[PDB]
Design an enzyme around this catalytic site. Structure first.
Site, short mmCIF file in Angstrom:
data_model
loop_
_atom_site.label_atom_id
_atom_site.label_comp_id
_atom_site.label_asym_id
_atom_site.label_seq_id
_atom_site.Cartn_x
_atom_site.Cartn_y
_atom_site.Cartn_z
N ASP A 123 3.79 -4.07 3.74
CA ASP A 123 4.29 -4.67 2.51
C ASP A 123 4.71 -3.64 1.49
OD1 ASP A 123 4.84 -6.14 0.31
OD2 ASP A 123 2.79 -6.93 0.11
N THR A 124 6.02 -3.39 1.52
CA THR A 124 6.62 -2.33 0.68
C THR A 124 6.54 -2.78 -0.80
OG1 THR A 124 8.85 -3.25 0.97
CG2 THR A 124 8.24 -1.52 2.52
N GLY A 125 6.35 -4.08 -1.06
CA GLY A 125 6.11 -4.63 -2.39
C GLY A 125 4.71 -4.41 -3.00
C1 3EM Z 1 4.16 1.79 -13.53
C2 3EM Z 1 3.96 0.31 -13.78
N1 3EM Z 1 2.54 0.19 -14.14
C3 3EM Z 1 2.36 -0.33 -15.52
C4 3EM Z 1 3.14 -1.61 -15.73
C5 3EM Z 1 1.96 -0.62 -13.23
C6 3EM Z 1 2.10 -0.34 -11.89
C7 3EM Z 1 1.55 -1.21 -10.93
C8 3EM Z 1 0.80 -2.33 -11.30
C9 3EM Z 1 0.25 -3.18 -10.34
C10 3EM Z 1 0.44 -2.93 -8.97
O1 3EM Z 1 0.17 -4.20 -8.34
C11 3EM Z 1 0.50 -4.35 -7.02
O2 3EM Z 1 1.23 -3.54 -6.48
N2 3EM Z 1 0.04 -5.47 -6.38
C12 3EM Z 1 0.32 -5.90 -4.99
C13 3EM Z 1 1.27 -7.13 -5.06
O3 3EM Z 1 0.84 -8.29 -5.28
N3 3EM Z 1 2.58 -6.84 -4.89
C14 3EM Z 1 3.65 -7.84 -5.00
C15 3EM Z 1 4.54 -7.34 -6.12
C16 3EM Z 1 4.50 -8.40 -6.96
C17 3EM Z 1 5.04 -9.62 -6.55
C18 3EM Z 1 5.00 -10.69 -7.42
C19 3EM Z 1 4.44 -10.54 -8.69
C20 3EM Z 1 3.90 -9.32 -9.08
C21 3EM Z 1 3.95 -8.25 -8.22
C22 3EM Z 1 4.58 -7.97 -3.81
C23 3EM Z 1 3.75 -8.11 -2.54
O4 3EM Z 1 4.67 -7.97 -1.45
C24 3EM Z 1 3.03 -9.47 -2.57
C25 3EM Z 1 1.92 -9.45 -1.56
C26 3EM Z 1 1.58 -10.76 -1.17
C27 3EM Z 1 2.37 -11.43 -0.23
C28 3EM Z 1 2.06 -12.71 0.21
C29 3EM Z 1 0.92 -13.37 -0.27
C30 3EM Z 1 0.12 -12.71 -1.20
C31 3EM Z 1 0.44 -11.40 -1.65
N4 3EM Z 1 3.96 -10.54 -2.17
C32 3EM Z 1 4.13 -11.68 -2.86
O5 3EM Z 1 3.51 -11.90 -3.91
O6 3EM Z 1 5.01 -12.57 -2.35
C33 3EM Z 1 5.45 -13.50 -3.32
C34 3EM Z 1 6.40 -14.42 -2.55
C35 3EM Z 1 7.65 -14.14 -2.20
N5 3EM Z 1 8.25 -15.16 -1.53
C36 3EM Z 1 7.49 -16.25 -1.36
S1 3EM Z 1 6.02 -15.92 -2.08
C37 3EM Z 1 -1.01 -6.31 -4.32
C38 3EM Z 1 -0.76 -7.08 -3.01
C39 3EM Z 1 -1.91 -5.08 -4.07
C40 3EM Z 1 -0.51 -4.24 -10.81
C41 3EM Z 1 -0.67 -4.45 -12.19
O7 3EM Z 1 -1.32 -5.42 -12.59
O8 3EM Z 1 -0.08 -3.62 -13.08
C42 3EM Z 1 0.65 -2.57 -12.65
C43 3EM Z 1 1.23 -1.74 -13.60
#
Ligand code: 3EM
Lengths: 99, 99
Positions: free
Chosen positions: A25-27
């Site tokens: 999961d590149t997301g």
């Molecule tokens: C530099 C920036 N800073 C400050 C702002 C950051 C950086 C990073 C973060 C992060 C980093 O967070 C994380 O990378 N989270 C991961 C996560 O959920 N990534 C998801 C990206 C995303 C999508 C939607 C909303 C928000 C973020 C995509 C993933 O591919 C997800 C994984 C997933 C897939 C399927 C079921 C559950 C989870 N797929 C997803 O949500 O698909 C949705 C559907 C699509 N089409 C039908 S549904 C997690 C799985 C470990 C969190 C945070 O709260 O604040 C941050 C702040």
């Protein structure tokens, strides 16, 4: 191996002596696994996605074999409908996106 | 192009005459975009992800240019912290995972 995306990119993983299926999961910045019992002392931490948030436990230098490629790193355990392998481990196994 | 994952895989897209940044997301079946106004008739649908669901609007045969590769397909608009390009469009641009 190159994996095209006409189907979800699900692969076999081995962690904590247990065999599981997980989504490449590149997301995802982080790797998060369904309820399983890891060893060792866990720090707390909280993560977000498309419908809201969830709470999880965090282990460092967990060994995970991903399609047979070893990686060590941070793993998170808490609740998800799917096991997810995030970019923290994708980098170790040399995983690229190509198009 | 081959894109490694030491950083998030963010790319330029052009949709509805508008230029945006979006995440190439092998963990997404569907492509979902932050509030923007797509013209045309929208069906309803509720995509789930982590933290539950979000309601979104659905448009078919939307044209999206993704790093310059054209794709047509289903696009969803509703609320997300990041624009996300899902496997429905990743397949059209020939996008693979390789490691
Ligand atoms: C530099 C920036 N800073 C400050 C702002 C950051 C950086 C990073 C973060 C992060 C980093 O967070 C994380 O990378 N989270 C991961 C996560 O959920 N990534 C998801 C990206 C995303 C999508 C939607 C909303 C928000 C973020 C995509 C993933 O591919 C997800 C994984 C997933 C897939 C399927 C079921 C559950 C989870 N797929 C997803 O949500 O698909 C949705 C559907 C699509 N089409 C039908 S549904 C997690 C799985 C470990 C969190 C945070 O709260 O604040 C941050 C702040």
């Amino acid at each position: 191996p190159q994996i095209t995306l006409w189907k979800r990119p699900l692969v076999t993983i081995k962690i904590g002596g247990q065999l599981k299926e997980a989504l490449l999961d590149t997301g995802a910045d982080d790797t998060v696994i369904e309820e399983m019992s890891l060893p060792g002392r866990w720090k707390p931490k909280m993560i977000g996605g498309i419908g809201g948030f969830i709470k999880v436990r965090q282990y460092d230098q967990i060994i995970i074999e991903i399609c047979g490629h070893k990686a060590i790193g941070t793993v998170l355990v808490g609740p998800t409908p799917v096991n997810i392998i995030g970019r923290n481990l994708l980098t170790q196994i040399g995983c690229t996106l190509n198009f």
